[PDB]
Amino acid sequence: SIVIFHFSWKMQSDVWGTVTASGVSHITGGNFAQSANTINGWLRDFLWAQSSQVIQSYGSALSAYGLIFLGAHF
Amino acid sequence: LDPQIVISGSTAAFLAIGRFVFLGYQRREANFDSNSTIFATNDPAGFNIIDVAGWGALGHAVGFAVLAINSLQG
Amino acid sequence: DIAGLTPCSESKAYAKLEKKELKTLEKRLKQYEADSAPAVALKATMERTKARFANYAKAGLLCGNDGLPHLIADPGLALKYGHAGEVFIPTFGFLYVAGYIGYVGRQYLIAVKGEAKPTDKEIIIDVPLATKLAWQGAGWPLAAVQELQRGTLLEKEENITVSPR
Amino acid sequence: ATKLFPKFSQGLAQDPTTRRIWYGLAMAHDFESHDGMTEENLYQKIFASHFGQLSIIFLWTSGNLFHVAWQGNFEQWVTDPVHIRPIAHAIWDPHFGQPAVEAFTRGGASGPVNISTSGVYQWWYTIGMRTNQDLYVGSVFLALVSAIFLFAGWLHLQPNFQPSLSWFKDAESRLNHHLSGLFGVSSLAWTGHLVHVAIPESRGQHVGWDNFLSVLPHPQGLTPFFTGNWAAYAQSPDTASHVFGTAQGSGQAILTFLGGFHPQTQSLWLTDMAHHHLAIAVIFIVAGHMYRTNFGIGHRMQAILEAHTPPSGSLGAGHKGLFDTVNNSLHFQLGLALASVGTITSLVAQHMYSLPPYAFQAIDFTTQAALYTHHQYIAGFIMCGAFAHGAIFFIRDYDPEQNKGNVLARMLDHKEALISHLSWVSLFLGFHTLGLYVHNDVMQAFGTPEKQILIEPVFAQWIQAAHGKALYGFDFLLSSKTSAAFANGQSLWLPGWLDAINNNQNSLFLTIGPGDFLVHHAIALGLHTTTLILVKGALDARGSKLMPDKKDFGYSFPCDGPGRGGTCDISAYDAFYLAVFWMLNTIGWVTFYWHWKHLTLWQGNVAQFDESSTYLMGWLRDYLWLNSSQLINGYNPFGMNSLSVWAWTFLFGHLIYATGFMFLISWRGYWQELIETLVWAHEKTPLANLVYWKDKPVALSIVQARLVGLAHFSVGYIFTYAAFLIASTSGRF
Amino acid sequence: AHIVKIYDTCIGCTQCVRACPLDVLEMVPWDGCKASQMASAPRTEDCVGCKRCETACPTDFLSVRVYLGSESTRSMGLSY
Amino acid sequence: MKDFTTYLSTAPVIATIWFTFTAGLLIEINRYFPDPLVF
Amino acid sequence: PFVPPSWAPSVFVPLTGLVLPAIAMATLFVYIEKEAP
Amino acid sequence: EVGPKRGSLVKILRPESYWFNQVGKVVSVDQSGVRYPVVVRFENQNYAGVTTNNYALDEVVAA
Ligand code: CLA
Ligand code: CLA
Ligand code: CLA
Ligand code: CLA
Ligand code: CLA
Ligand code: CLA
Ligand code: CLA
Ligand code: CLA
Ligand SMILES: CC1=C(/C=C/C(C)=C/C=C\C(C)=C\C=C\C=C(C)\C=C\C=C(C)\C=C\C2=C(C)CCCC2(C)C)C(C)(C)CCC1
Ligand code: SF4
Ligand SMILES: [Ca+2]
């Protein structure tokens, strides 16, 4: 679980992202080299911030994921 | 409402119903209820100081309740 | 009306909610063509939404301040203001099916209990006997009441195992 | 060889392993299990323990008073109790850097201080404290009282001062003195303080020990009391424009029953509280003359118990022999006391948030949240303790021969029926509440919120309408103006009460909907399941079909071995152990409901709670995820603020909880084998084998493991929720 | 040390003695069963409390009972 | 065939067939009667 | 008055955090390992 | 000849027994002076997987 969390944060922070004019912008803005050295950073920037999509997925095509997100907690 | 008349009447009335009405019943219940002090008295019906204090307390409470209710003007 | 609620046929939030759902469905439908499978599916969903809202308002349901319907669980209020179809009739319906299943299972257990090997009849279901009892369980309340009146529904105290206290 | 510790158990003292220290520490208060313990010595030890506990409580109260008078801002908070935050005490931490020092420097102080959430400021200000000198005098007085209690505890254990065994069993005298003296006289004294100090201090008149003997609390001066014209005391009360602490619009009455709340402070009237304490003081004093002690008159609890058997034989022997099985069993009395205490604690939490008794307490949202949660968790722990002591009573002090045919024996006679019906209730509640929640969640996920099941709580709303709330429209009892119940209180207390209950800006009977109905069912599920576990563990403590001789093994033991299919968690201690988790879960649900409803009320949007409390996604996103944004932002790479301590406490509680999971999942054997390998490693290491242990290192026992895991679970749970609650409420307001 | 007791319901099947891993139980002559034998516990100072004997007992209820008592070096089964 | 019917009469096969029938009946009921919330 | 000095936390906090716990821990540890006669 | 007849059904009265208030078939009754001569076999096994036990003369009642 820690391995996949590190992979997801590193890829979304320093590898994946769109390409703009004269610069590359990542998904999270490259906050892994500044916020991954603390547990609070992992809980806030990677777990609290990135879970916004799975909790507000209701009413869209990803709502099922949200349901499973709740079911899996059960 | 006169406080002296109400208090005197209430105390005398409950002492009368305690000495001439509920004395035998209280004595029969106290006997079946089964270091101490025996309070000997010259009353022919055994109305000791303890019973006088208890009945007087009930009479004073009822008299003060009557005085208070009449004082409220309701 | 009841508990400060208004009927769904006269609630503004109810109509606004219906318009919101139809608006998002229509917005999703505008991106497709007219004679394509997703468009027909979206139109079918929209028709289902219209029929659902019309049926809920037609049923006389009571809505709240959020535009959603409310159920009346009190038997007196339900039978007095025309709300017995929410929680009363389905309650008796579940009671009938619940006692139906319970009586069928009880009859099967008591029937296979007197046989030589009841455990085999428990892991391997005797389909003919189970089917016969399933069809005969329609008179479960009558049979249960008759069993209760005869005293054969319960077991005596001396025939049940208990702890050493 | 045999060590000196413990001194109360020679068997534990002969233990050459680390288990001796843990067991000696965990069995020190088990007075009945010591070496050479009698009944008289047992009661004397408990008496000394009671005195020591009282001394600790009083010293702690004095410490709070002293710190508020020294590092607090009580002298400035009383002048502006709406825009000034209370200060608990200063902070002296050498680990703090410059940003921490300026971040915690708040509340008008000169250094880093902690903002209190206990609500002692409002309570002390309401009872009469105005200057720091009053708090200092109170702290000194309470410290001296604590010292006297400690000396009394030491004195009662020495010869010529130890009470006899018969003295401890004088139930009639002790109950008469507690009902008349500890309850009635104490309440009467509080009435005297409220009338003589609190009421004059709230009207701008300073009354203290230097001038209370010359200042009259009423202009008539004790005359209406002796003349029976008590109605003159309620004349000229505080008007609707009264300012707390000043004489503007202040009345002259001392005992009224206006009801409702004060218009400014949004708290109960002081005159009504004084009148309340006087009435209950009279009732408790009168009730203190019910049992016969040394003057012939009175009652005998044994006679009343033995004279309460129905003629039909429905209760068997009735209550015959109940006096002997209770007076001779300390666990029964402790269980009854803990049950009543826990219920009263829950009553306190509910009554204090709904009916605020202290001035400017409703505006302090953090105080309300913290106080309610604190009292509810304490009540849950106390209830679990009551049931645990009941199980201890069945195993240690129950006598079937003495209790033959009474209600107590009949409880064990049909215990299977009780456990089965509790199981059915818990199963029904769990299945239906979970089903309705999942159904509402699926409807919200599929984009159809009108398809979810929303049952209107007509029963509780009907009760609220009976109390006087006209929002629903039932119009009956106190809601209808033509009713006798309504017209009979219009001249005594109904105006203020109706004005306060119909106002939707307070916590007095809040409006409820389907979300409240569903969460109430969840609360009922938690209560019934916790009761099921505790009741089943107490009734099955003496034995069952799996262990017919469980009464011969004591209250707490590991198991009966892997035989008979397995006997893990078979003791009553294990039932309590599994019930603590359900208690924490139930209190978690009630505190979550309270916090969310009040947060949406204070934010001015109750519709958010009413619309998102029906599906669990709303609870997880709109309450747990939405209110933690400021909490987890206490410290980040951009700096920190005063909310960083709550973020650290949040992570601290999470770590403790996860650590408890280790003792809860992993069991002894693996650890003992690992310890054996470590023992070999230390014994075969040069320059280190010269330092040998005095106690043989062994793995923690099964019971100790369960207790350690439970302790970590509870500590992490409590700290995590307290940190989140205080941080969210303080940052939001 | 742990308390090991033998009750009169013992049928003398000798299964509890064979299941004992530290040689605590034994068989003595008796006159209360057909086998004319009865289990005995004369070396309870070496019992650890594994309850293997209780698992091996076939009587209902058990004839051999183990009660956890004061822990020591032999009772805790420590090799150090 | 007797052994095959006995195998089909076991608890998991009977449970599968019964739950499939019940689920199919409920699904078809909701299909021909969309969104039933009341009676 | 009963007000403590300004330097009181700087002396009582290190005392209660390092002097008192060390003395208490050492005393208790010595007491636990005391062998009976 | 003393005790219940072989092959009959008796009820167990021992409170600590797993088969308390349950019916069991009689197997054999010992003719010596043993405390528990009646042997009762039950269709349902206990938690230990045993189906036979030895009970006393007064511990079993004909039912
Ligand atoms: C499961 C528990 C339960 C609870 C908490 C309630 C609660 C309630 N019921 Mg009730 N009820 C129940 C079960 C329950 N019911 C069951 C199982 C039945 C089937 C027999 C009924 C049938 C029933 C009827 C017919 C009525 C209620 C009514 C009521 C409401 C007020 C009456 C009352 O409190 O007395 C308890 C209720 C009873 C003992 C049943 C008899 C009805 C009593 C005598 C009240 C009738 C007097 C009058 C109509 C009250 C209205 C005053 C005013 C508003 C006009 C109240 C909220 C009344 C109502 O509000 O009408 C909409 C009403 O008339 N109930
Ligand atoms: C013949 C089937 C049957 C019947 C008549 C009952 C009846 C009863 N059960 Mg029970 N139960 C059953 C099966 C059954 N159960 C099974 C299979 C289980 C294991 C999951 C349980 C587990 C169970 C528990 C844990 C509890 C009960 C309880 C109860 C009592 C309360 C009512 C209730 O609905 O509880 C709830 C019922 C359930 C949770 C399970 C229902 C399962 C289905 C619907 C029953 C039929 C299944 C079966 C495969 C069909 C028969 C096939 C045959 C025709 C070929 C009641 C007398 C409670 C009690 O102790 O008494 C007060 C209680 O706590 N039951
Ligand atoms: C009038 C005489 C009298 C008085 C005043 C007391 C007083 C006391 N006795 Mg005692 N006792 C007496 C006679 C008396 N006794 C006699 C005659 C006997 C012999 C027959 C005994 C035998 C006896 C025993 C064996 C014990 C006591 C004990 C106690 C202490 C109980 C500790 C406690 O629970 O806190 C005080 C409790 C209350 C004030 C009641 C609180 C009511 C509820 C719970 C709270 C509600 C109040 C309010 C809402 C909360 C305030 C809010 C805010 C201000 C915080 C207490 C100080 C215990 C003890 O010794 O402790 C050292 C105990 O072990 N007594
Ligand atoms: C008036 C309250 C009261 C009283 C007088 C007692 C008295 C007693 N209880 Mg009891 N109990 C109570 C309430 C009470 N209990 C409550 C509220 C609960 C629910 C939590 C329990 C649950 C309970 C159980 C399960 C048991 C007892 C037992 C006992 C008996 C002896 C054990 C003992 O106390 O040793 C000393 C107590 C301890 C050493 C406490 C253990 C250490 C705890 C876990 C501290 C952890 C807190 C942690 C460090 C907090 C710091 C966190 C921070 C650093 C971050 C004793 C007569 C035991 C018994 O009867 O023996 C057979 C028994 O098994 N109680
Ligand atoms: C989220 C965790 C969780 C859950 C759901 C439960 C649930 C339950 N506990 Mg439990 N408990 C827990 C944690 C949990 N516990 C923990 C951590 C402890 C401390 C060790 C305990 C200790 C404990 C004790 C000591 C007891 C319980 C009891 C119960 C039962 C109470 C009866 C009830 O509410 O009926 C509701 C039923 C349910 C909620 C079951 C869930 C329904 C499922 C989701 C439906 C099936 C889904 C679908 C149809 C099929 C999917 C399966 C698929 C593979 C095909 C219940 C099943 C009590 C009990 O046994 O009651 C008789 C009991 O005594 N609990
Ligand atoms: C977050 C909870 C938690 C924590 C902290 C631990 C911690 C640990 N586990 Mg563990 N585990 C857990 C959950 C946890 N586990 C759960 C839920 C399970 C069940 C599956 C297990 C099952 C398990 C097994 C099977 C094993 C461990 C092992 C270990 C130890 C590994 C050694 C190590 O990590 O070095 C360092 C220690 C830590 C990182 C722990 C935290 C130490 C803190 C950060 C230091 C703070 C010091 C501080 C200044 C102290 C001052 C105190 C002050 C008040 C005076 C370690 C102590 C292994 C072991 O035994 O050791 C090799 C082992 O085999 N665990
Ligand atoms: C139980 C009540 C209580 C509590 C929880 C605290 C807590 C605290 N005090 Mg305080 N104190 C108290 C009572 C209390 N005090 C009383 C009654 C006095 C008046 C004599 C003082 C005088 C005092 C001063 C002058 C200072 C503190 C300071 C502090 C803080 C630093 C840590 C410390 O312990 O310092 C020291 C605590 C003391 C010297 C008081 C101990 C004296 C009592 C009588 C001993 C009690 C023994 C105890 C019950 C035995 C068990 C404890 C333990 C061994 C298990 C801390 C927040 C310092 C501060 O402000 O930090 C910023 C500081 O300078 N306290
Ligand atoms: C509860 C009381 C307490 C107190 C009062 C302190 C106080 C202090 N700690 Mg400490 N700490 C504590 C608990 C405490 N700690 C706990 C529980 C832990 C485990 C989590 C730690 C872990 C810890 C670490 C890792 C460090 C500190 C450091 C420090 C020092 C801060 C360095 C500084 O900026 O000042 C200026 C520094 C000085 C003026 C030098 C003073 C030299 C020492 C501290 C005093 C003289 C030694 C004295 C004679 C011996 C006392 C021992 C006594 C018990 C017998 C400071 C004096 C830091 C440190 O040690 O500084 C290098 C640091 O590295 N602490
Ligand atoms: C185990 C055990 C035990 C037990 C315990 C318990 C029992 C617990 C619980 C519980 C609880 C915790 C309870 C409580 C309760 C309560 C009640 C029972 C109540 C009530 C009510 C009423 C009666 C009311 C009325 C009213 C109303 C309705 C409102 C208004 C007012 C009036 C008054 C009118 C003991 C220790 C003894 C011992 C033995 C063992
Ligand atoms: S296993 Fe039980 S019955 Fe057999 S010899 Fe041992 S104690 Fe006796
Ligand atoms: Ca003053």
From Swiss-Prot, chain A:
<protein>
    <recommendedName>
        <fullName>Photosystem I P700 chlorophyll a apoprotein A1</fullName>
    </recommendedName>
</protein>
<comment type="subunit">
    <text>The PsaA/B heterodimer binds the P700 chlorophyll special pair and subsequent electron acceptors. PSI consists of a core antenna complex that captures photons, and an electron transfer chain that converts photonic excitation into a charge separation. The eukaryotic PSI reaction center is composed of at least 11 subunits.</text>
</comment>
<comment type="similarity">
    <text>Belongs to the PsaA/PsaB family.</text>
</comment>
<feature type="binding site" description="axial binding residue">
    <location>
        <position position="73"/>
    </location>
    <ligand>
        <name>chlorophyll a'</name>
    </ligand>
</feature>
<comment type="function">
    <text>PsaA and PsaB bind P700, the primary electron donor of photosystem I (PSI), as well as the electron acceptors A0, A1 and FX. PSI is a plastocyanin/cytochrome c6-ferredoxin oxidoreductase, converting photonic excitation into a charge separation, which transfers an electron from the donor P700 chlorophyll pair to the spectroscopically characterized acceptors A0, A1, FX, FA and FB in turn. Oxidized P700 is reduced on the lumenal side of the thylakoid membrane by plastocyanin or cytochrome c6.</text>
</comment>
<comment type="function">
    <text>Both potential cofactor branches in PSI seem to be active; however, electron transfer seems to proceed preferentially down the path including the phylloquinone bound by PsaA.</text>
</comment>
From Swiss-Prot, chain B:
<keyword id="KW-0934">Plastid</keyword>
<keyword id="KW-0150">Chloroplast</keyword>
<keyword id="KW-1133">Transmembrane helix</keyword>
<keyword id="KW-0603">Photosystem I</keyword>
<comment type="similarity">
    <text>Belongs to the PsaG/PsaK family.</text>
</comment>
<keyword id="KW-0793">Thylakoid</keyword>
<dbReference type="GO" id="GO:0015979">
    <property type="term" value="P:photosynthesis"/>
</dbReference>
<keyword id="KW-0812">Transmembrane</keyword>
<protein>
    <recommendedName>
        <fullName>Photosystem I reaction center subunit V, chloroplastic</fullName>
    </recommendedName>
</protein>
<comment type="function">
    <text>Not yet known.</text>
</comment>
<feature type="transmembrane region" description="Helical">
    <location>
        <begin position="5"/>
        <end position="25"/>
    </location>
</feature>
<dbReference type="GO" id="GO:0009535">
    <property type="term" value="C:chloroplast thylakoid membrane"/>
</dbReference>
UniProtKB/Swiss-Prot annotation, chain C:
<dbReference type="GO" id="GO:0009543">
    <property type="term" value="C:chloroplast thylakoid lumen"/>
</dbReference>
<keyword id="KW-0934">Plastid</keyword>
<keyword id="KW-0793">Thylakoid</keyword>
<dbReference type="GO" id="GO:0009538">
    <property type="term" value="C:photosystem I reaction center"/>
</dbReference>
<keyword id="KW-0809">Transit peptide</keyword>
<keyword id="KW-0603">Photosystem I</keyword>
<keyword id="KW-0602">Photosynthesis</keyword>
<protein>
    <recommendedName>
        <fullName>Photosystem I reaction center subunit III, chloroplastic</fullName>
    </recommendedName>
</protein>
<comment type="function">
    <text>Probably participates in efficiency of electron transfer from plastocyanin to P700 (or cytochrome c553 in algae and cyanobacteria). This plastocyanin-docking protein contributes to the specific association of plastocyanin to PSI.</text>
</comment>
<dbReference type="GO" id="GO:0015979">
    <property type="term" value="P:photosynthesis"/>
</dbReference>
<keyword id="KW-0150">Chloroplast</keyword>
<comment type="similarity">
    <text>Belongs to the PsaF family.</text>
</comment>
UniProtKB/Swiss-Prot annotation, chain E:
<feature type="binding site">
    <location>
        <position position="53"/>
    </location>
    <ligand>
        <name>[4Fe-4S] cluster 2</name>
    </ligand>
</feature>
<feature type="binding site">
    <location>
        <position position="50"/>
    </location>
    <ligand>
        <name>[4Fe-4S] cluster 2</name>
    </ligand>
</feature>
<dbReference type="InterPro" id="IPR017491">
    <property type="entry name" value="PSI_PsaC"/>
</dbReference>
<comment type="subunit">
    <text>The eukaryotic PSI reaction center is composed of at least 11 subunits.</text>
</comment>
<keyword id="KW-0411">Iron-sulfur</keyword>
<keyword id="KW-0249">Electron transport</keyword>
<keyword id="KW-0408">Iron</keyword>
<keyword id="KW-0793">Thylakoid</keyword>
<feature type="domain" description="4Fe-4S ferredoxin-type 1">
    <location>
        <begin position="1"/>
        <end position="30"/>
    </location>
</feature>
<feature type="binding site">
    <location>
        <position position="13"/>
    </location>
    <ligand>
        <name>[4Fe-4S] cluster 1</name>
    </ligand>
</feature>
<keyword id="KW-0602">Photosynthesis</keyword>
<feature type="binding site">
    <location>
        <position position="16"/>
    </location>
    <ligand>
        <name>[4Fe-4S] cluster 1</name>
    </ligand>
</feature>
